[PDB]
Each structure stands twice: as C-alpha cells, then as structure tokens.
Symmetry: C2
Subunit: 86 residues, 2 copies
Amino acid sequence: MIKVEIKPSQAQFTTRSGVSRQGKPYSLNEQLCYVDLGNEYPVLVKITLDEGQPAYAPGLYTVHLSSFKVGQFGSLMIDRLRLVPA
Amino acid sequence: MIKVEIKPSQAQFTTRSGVSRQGKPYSLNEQLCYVDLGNEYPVLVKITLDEGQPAYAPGLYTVHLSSFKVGQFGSLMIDRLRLVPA
C-alpha cells in the first residue's frame, strides 16, 4: 500500500477553468498531498479531484483501485489518484 | 493492494530491439499478466521488465512501491510495473 498524507496546510483546493475544443466550459479542482515513495522524505504530488467531490480532509489515506486503467499501449497507468481513508 | 497474476501460459517474455537516436543498441523484454481492476474478470496488461531481470514465474503478486514516480506535471505516474510475491 501507498501511504498518502494530506497535511493541515493542504486542506483546500484551487480551481482552474477554461473551454474545451468545441465550446463546453470545464472546471478542474486541484489539491496537494505528500506521498511516501520510500526516499528520505515524502514527496509533494498534485491531485485533480473528481466532479462534485470535496477536498480530502487532513489525515492518512491509501490509493483506491479505481485510480488505475489500462492505457492505449496495453500497460497499466494512473488515471486520477483516488484516495480512501487508511 | 493490487492483485496481479502471471498465468502458466504467461511464463515467458518476448524481446523487442532497436537503436536509439544517437546510435546505441537497446533491448526490451516484455511479459503479459492479469490485473484485477474490480471488473467482472481481470484484464490483460503488458509489463516491460528491468535490465537483467528474468520473467516472473507463474503465481500471485502485488505491485512494489518502486513502480511509481512523480511525472513532469507534478502528478503521480507509473514508471514500470515492478512486482513482488504476494
């Protein structure tokens, strides 16, 4: 299991916006977190949230299976990092 | 944890080869596996092995932390799916 932590300072999201190729508006909410990749300290990672989802509260989390998909060359990829409480 | 299975029919690798932009030879070994993504059946996934590593034997495996890296846009990505026995 991957250990992910939302620190107290990372409890909010920011929103970027724009317009798709054929005219539709979009909004993307982004939140920061720390992921332990086994180096001397955890590293900073950006998360893009799913539609209608609030910012994750501060705490410890692991990665849900729905984060992964098979990509166009047949290898596994991350779609969006989706978290669940540890 | 992600459940990965190497079936008896997937016990071998194949090798693709070529030449880099500035002349160096390369060889890549590829193996197939099944990954359970929570659908009605596991899905077929291609693995590219690391240099000097044999094909994984048939059996159950999970994904090692070294499979992941932070990408150039600051989000988590899979580098290569690296497995360890379950």
